[PDB]
Design a protein around this ligand. Structure first.
Ligand SMILES: [Ca+2]
Lengths: 461, 863
């Protein structure tokens, strides 16, 4: 009793199992009312549904509002919107995710690929040429024996991967056409090396490892089209080349990027983004970059937290970039936190100047008792404290272990301490553990001295 | 209960005892230092006069104090001693001393008091001392729990019989006696109290030979624990020896023997009785007000003296009568009168209420300002009751000249319903009448301005059976009314925001059925994220980011970032969702737009915490749509919504040559403000409505917005000490608010600066006193601070997106503590000692979101 909004079933929480029972084959679109891609796909979905209504059989097209029927979306592990899942009601234990194109044609062609054979038999060299030319990535299995063990392995890997067309040839003229003596499997693609030859034992498992690895291009341009592909993938480390289309020697610059991409194929996604484009301005702000600071590279990891990393060098030759990614992968690059430039003479005066770069080095020094003013440059309270804090530095300028310092909290990020007002005075004793003592006594030279001399016990516990 | 036994005496024997009682008042650090008080000592004769011939444990004893003296408790008083060179007679008065030394009869059955006998015409204070001493003779030699009447009233009492002692523990909370007093049940604004009463009976060879009783009273202000006090009162009764005593008297009934002993002996109650100080040469209310009024000028409400006078005057009003109050009101001018209305309403007595209700004509348009002050004062009333509710209900049912005031009445009725519901009075008659009136007034949908009134009342009353209506209105898509309903839902506790509630709120956020306003949608999502959101609840909201209109993406992102940054309840579940790259990535989390959300700490301790929260939704134009500032105060689990200040705007796009967002071209230009103060939702205030009214009012000079005195903390105890003395504990917390706004605007210069100055002055007073009528000891303290908080907004609007720099600035504040202890004699100055401390609390700025700090760098750049 669901409605046929343009010949498309409307499935709800209450009526999902009944309709799942009443069709052997069911294609469900999980969507959101506000979703742009779900809007763009909605009429093509209605077309393929309508075309199969007056010509189709048992395959029925359904849709669920995941923002209303959220139990369902969770139950079937929806990722983003839309998600299209194919249910057999012979395997209620896992539907098959649709990964192909979003045209109403691509749909029915994918549905028939469920009923037909995983690969097309290629009788001659012209049929091979055709298939290779049909897609961006194509795979041919050359197997003398079609009934072979090897060949049955390959026909399984070709049911699994649905976004690439597969062919099988047992004709020797085809084999010799692509230069294969023995049996084998070749992946063809319209980018990079163009051809990849499989090596080792012909297992379904070893095939997927080969295809998935070799199907991805070296470099991907960031666009509204590539974005969901990027964030849909499995690589959670990205390096971004901010490359303005107007820059001098665009091709040369991207060239070096493409080179470095090779050394890290399975490990780091190499992305370039047009720093000049209006759409990308928001992304530049996220990496704290200005149009004028490009070209530049930034590496980011995408987990519970997103963590950004900056190269030590500003040069963008293939070498420097590889050197960057290598040192990152080892553990030798530190997360990029906002920091000012450490002044040449940061320690010339009684009060030490700390920035984000050198904060942990000075403050969490085990042998030093460090007292830090965290301030904002425009604050009148901070301005009023400055002469007193100066006199405090002056008092301790020759001390054996006490260090008086200051940091502009608005211009430098520190992970270890949170600043809830300006100014904040925090004491970091000479200790093995990273103890921090908040100072809430009088803002007077006298109050400060009493606290410092008591080792942080008379002014704060 | 006729199986226990207490004291037994021998026939023809006179018992010779010593008796001592002393009281100490202390600042209550835990260790008693240099305190004030006094000791009353005497000899005591006890003789058995009669015993029931039926052989039952039924006796009549005679108790006499002799050689009564009054002395210092403090050993260092020296030449400052109030007792120097004065006889017991000169200290207490000839007639008092005689009264104290006249005998007393106690009729005991099974060791418990059956009747107490004394001379009728004696001072109350003195009869109390006698009752105090007599009460010690009531006891039990075996263990158990029971109900007893004595000086302390009718109390539940527990006896622990040991080898050489019996312990009498009195449950002071259970005592039935008529004593004035009150204390707010709100943990954050309240005062904690402990009362112990322990009497020990020392046993030798099965007989009592001594009685030691100690009573303690401890108070502490919850909010600030340096504000505390202690009362210690002790009693000692020791048997010295026995002598040959009067012969037993004969008779079948105790009553006949008493008439024969002396016919002036009358049965009087053993329970201690209230007595009034009886002021000698003290000025009247009008005389006091003549001095007080000098400090309560509208010009200087910010000075600590103003608040001091306000609080002091409230104490006087609490003893005055309707007529003298009404008189003062009637003769006062227009400028000071609002302050006096504050004071009179704060008094919260039958007489003060009737005086102000009489003074104020709700049909008048000349007393609008005072009508308001009256009604707000009721909102903040520290200890409201059914009588105050009844007065308000009837004012509403009566005739009211201004509809703004009619709204105000209904709004305050809301708070009173809330307060009386939290104080075990949810089923009181006037509460059920006001509930029907709100819930009912919200079903019968009348004019649009009437629905708003009821919603605001329900925003205060927070009745759970009102939730279905709130959901109806939140979903109605009725703009202003829909937001209101949403924000009201937002005030309810977590157990009321159920799945059905969240189901509705999801449809509002996601627009599954129809389009809703941005302000409504954001508020709905805030309630969801704040109330045990499911995985999918969070997931769907995260997935929406990047697919909504311009500023709404920025705002929702800011909401979520703030949940992570501040570890709010839903933190953990959000972090679960953030595991997935599809939801959490530099594309979805890269937003342009100005909207923000930031939570910080004002103060944090192991015990208490104070938070500030700023979240701002902008229009596509870059003009403010809705800002919320929230300040909460916490003590343990207990919370208090100290402040909320919401600013709304629409259709202001013409004030620059900007254009309204898609849809907003038919929206009339408007700016308003809605506020909560100390849990009370106030009546929202329109700054201007329509273009002609806007172009009509208008600049950069200060402008009063809210001005007023509030009695926030209010604790009162009247105590019957077991010794017979009278004790009073009083803790008052008053404050003066003085908010003022200024704006500079230049279209040609594309600049704007807004300054809102909140001037807050707090004074917290304590007063402890023990009175015996001939002597009085007191300990009083005053703590005061003159605080200041400023919010500044600097806008450079030449190019969208505009530069906005916001600042929250707390001024350096003076902090002053006062203490006065005294011992006094009913005439004379007595002993007085005063101390004064004066420190300075340092100022600061509070950071907002990092993007704000970035924009402040630019605004205040060196050139
Ligand atoms: Ca250290």
């Amino acid at each position: 009793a669901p409605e046929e909004e343009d010949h498309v079933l409307v499935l709800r929480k209450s009526n999902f199992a009944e309709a799942l029972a009443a069709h052997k084959y069911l294609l469900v679109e999980f969507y959101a009312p506000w979703c742009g891609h779900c809007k763009a796909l909605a009429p093509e979905y209605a077309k393929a549904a309508g075309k199969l209504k007056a010509e189709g059989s048992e395959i029925r097209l359904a849709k669920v509002d995941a923002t209303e029927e959220s139990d369902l979306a969770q139950q079937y592990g929806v990722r983003g919107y839309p998600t299209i899942k194919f249910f057999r009601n012979g395997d209620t234990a896992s539907p098959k995710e649709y990964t192909a194109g979003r045209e109403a044609d691509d749909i029915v062609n994918w549905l028939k690929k469920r009923t037909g054979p995983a690969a097309t038999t290629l009788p001659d060299g012209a049929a091979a040429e055709s298939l290779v030319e049909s897609s961006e990535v194509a795979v041919i299995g050359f197997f003398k024996d079609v009934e072979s063990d090897s060949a049955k392995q390959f026909l399984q890997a070709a049911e699994a991967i649905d976004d690439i067309p597969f062919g099988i040839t047992s004709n020797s003229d085809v084999f010799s056409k692509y230069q294969l003596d023995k049996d084998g499997v070749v992946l063809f693609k319209k980018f990079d090396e163009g051809r990849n030859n499989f090596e080792g034992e012909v297992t379904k498992e070893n095939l997927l490892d080969f295809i998935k690895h070799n199907q991805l291009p070296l470099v991907i341009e960031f666009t509204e089209q590539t974005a969901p592909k990027i964030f849909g993938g499995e690589i959670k480390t990205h390096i971004l080349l901010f490359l303005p289309k107007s820059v001098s020697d665009y091709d040369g610059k991207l060239s070096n990027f493409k080179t470095a991409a090779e050394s890290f194929k399975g490990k780091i996604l190499f992305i370039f983004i047009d720093s000049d484009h209006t759409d990308n301005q928001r992304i530049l702000e996220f990496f704290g970059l200005k149009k004028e600071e490009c070209p530049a590279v930034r590496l980011i990891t995408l987990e519970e937290e997103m963590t950004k990393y900056k190269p030590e060098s500003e040069e963008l030759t293939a070498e420097r970039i590889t050197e960057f990614c290598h040192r990152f992968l080892e553990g030798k690059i530190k997360p990029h936190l906002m920091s000012q430039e450490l002044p040449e003479d940061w320690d010339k005066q009684p009060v030490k100047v700390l920035v984000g770069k050198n904060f942990e080095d000075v403050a969490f020094d085990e042998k030093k008792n460090v007292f830090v003013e965290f301030y904002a440059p425009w604050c009148g309270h901070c301005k009023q404290l400055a002469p007193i804090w100066d006199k405090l530095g002056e008092t301790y300028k020759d001390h054996e272990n006490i260090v008086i310092a200051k940091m502009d909290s608005t211009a430098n990020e520190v992970e270890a301490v949170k600043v809830h007002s300006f100014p904040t005075l925090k004491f970091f004793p000479a200790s093995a553990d990273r103890t921090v003592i908040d100072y809430n006594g009088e803002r007077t030279l006298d109050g400060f001295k009493k606290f410092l001399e008591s080792g942080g016990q008379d002014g704060a516990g | 209960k006729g199986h226990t036994t207490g004291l037994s005496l021998n026939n023809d024997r006179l018992y010779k005892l010593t008796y001592s009682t002393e009281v100490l008042l202390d600042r209550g650090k835990g260790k008693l230092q240099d305190s004030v008080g006094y000791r009353i000592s005497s000899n005591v004769d006890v003789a058995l006069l009669w015993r029931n011939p039926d052989g039952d444990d039924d006796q009549l004893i005679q108790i006499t104090m002799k050689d009564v003296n009054v002395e210092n408790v403090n050993q260092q008083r020296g030449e400052k001693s109030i007792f120097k060179g004065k006889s017991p007679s000169k200290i207490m008065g000839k007639e008092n001393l005689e009264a104290l030394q006249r005998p007393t009869l106690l009729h005991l059955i099974h060791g418990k008091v059956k009747e107490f006998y004394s001379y009728q015409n004696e001072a109350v204070a003195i009869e109390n001392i006698k009752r105090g001493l007599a009460s010690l003779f009531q006891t039990q030699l075996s263990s158990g729990t029971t109900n007893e009447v004595d000086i302390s009233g009718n109390c539940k009492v527990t006896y622990q019989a040991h080898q050489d002692k019996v312990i009498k523990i009195k449950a002071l909370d259970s005592c039935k006696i008529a004593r004035s007093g009150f204390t707010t049940p709100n943990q954050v604004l309240g005062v904690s109290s402990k009362a112990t009463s322990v009497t020990t009976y020392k046993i030798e060879d099965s007989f009592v030979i001594a009685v030691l009783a100690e009573e303690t009273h401890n108070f502490g202000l919850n909010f600030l624990q340096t504000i505390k006090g202690k009362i210690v009162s002790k009693q000692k009764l020791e048997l010295k020896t026995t002598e040959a005593g009067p012969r037993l008297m004969s008779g079948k009934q105790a009553a006949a023997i008493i008439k024969a002993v002396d016919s002036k002996y009358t049965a009087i109650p053993i329970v201690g009785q209230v007595f009034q100080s009886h002021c000698k040469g003290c000025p009247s209310l009008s005389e006091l007000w003549r001095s007080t009024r000098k400090y309560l000028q509208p010009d200087n409400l910010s000075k600590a003296e103003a608040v001091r006078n306000f609080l002091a005057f409230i104490q006087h009003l609490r003893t005055a009568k309707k007529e003298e109050i009404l008189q003062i009101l009637k003769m006062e001018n227009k400028e000071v009168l609002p302050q006096l209305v504050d004071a009179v309403t704060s008094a919260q007595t039958s007489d003060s209420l009737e005086a102000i209700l009489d003074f104020l004509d709700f049909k008048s348009d000349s007393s609008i300002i005072l009508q308001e002050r009256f009604l707000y004062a009721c909102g903040f009333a520290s200890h409201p009751n059914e009588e105050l509710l009844r007065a308000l209900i009837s004012k509403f049912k009566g005739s009211i000249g201004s509809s703004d005031i009619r709204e105000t009445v209904m709004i305050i009725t809301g708070t009173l319903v809330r307060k009386l519901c939290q104080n075990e009075g949810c089923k009181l008659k006037a509460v059920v009448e006001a509930k029907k009136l709100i819930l009912g007034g919200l079903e019968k949908a009348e004019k649009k301005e009437d629905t708003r009134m009821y919603l605001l009342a329900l925003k205060n009353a927070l009745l759970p059976e009102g939730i279905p209506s709130l959901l109806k209105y939140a979903e109605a898509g009725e703009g202003p009314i829909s937001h209101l309903a949403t924000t009201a839902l937002q005030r309810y506790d977590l157990p009321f925001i159920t799945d059905e509630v969240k189901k509705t709120l999801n449809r509002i956020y996601h627009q599954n059925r129809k389009v809703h306003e941005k302000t409504v949608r954001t508020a709905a999502a805030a309630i969801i994220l704040n109330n045990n959101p499911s995985y999918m609840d969070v997931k769907n909201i995260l997935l929406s980011i990047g697919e909504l209109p311009q500023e709404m993406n920025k705002y929702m992102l800011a909401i979520v970032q703030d949940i992570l940054r501040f570890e709010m309840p839903a933190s953990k579940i959000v972090r679960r969702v953030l595991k997935e790259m599809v939801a959490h990535n530099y594309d979805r989390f890269s937003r342009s737009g100005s909207s923000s959300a930031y939570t910080g700490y004002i103060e944090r301790s192991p015990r208490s915490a104070s938070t500030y929260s700023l979240d701002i939704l902008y229009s596509g134009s870059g003009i403010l749509r809705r800002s919320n500032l929230n300040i909460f105060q916490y003590i343990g689990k207990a919370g208090l919504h100290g402040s909320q200040v919401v600013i709304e705007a629409q259709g202001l796009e013409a004030l620059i040559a900007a254009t309204p967002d898609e849809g907003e071209e038919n929206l009339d230009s408007y700016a308003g403000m809605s506020a909560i103060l100390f849990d009370v939702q106030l009546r929202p205030v329109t700054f201007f409505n329509g273009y002609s009214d806007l172009m009509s009012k208008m600049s950069g000079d200060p402008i009063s917005v809210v001005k007023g005195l509030i009695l926030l903390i209010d604790h009162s105890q009247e105590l019957q000490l077991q010794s017979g003395l009278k004790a009073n504990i009083e803790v008052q917390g008053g404050l003066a608010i003085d908010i003022s706004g200024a704006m500079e605007f230049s279209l040609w210069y594309r600049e704007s600066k807004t300054r809102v100055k909140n001037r807050v002055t707090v004074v917290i007073t304590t007063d402890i006193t023990v009175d015996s009528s001939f002597v009085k000891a007191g300990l009083e303290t005053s703590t005061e601070t003159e605080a200041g908080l400023e919010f500044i907004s600097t806008v450079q609007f030449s190019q969208y997106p505009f530069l906005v720099c916001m600042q929250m600035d707390k001024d350096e504040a003076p902090f002053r503590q006062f203490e006065k202890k005294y011992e006094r004699l009913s005439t004379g100055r007595g002993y007085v000692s005063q101390k004064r401390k004066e420190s300075v609390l340092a100022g600061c700025e509070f950071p907002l979101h990092q993007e704000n700090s970035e924009m402040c760098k630019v605004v205040f750049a060196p050139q």
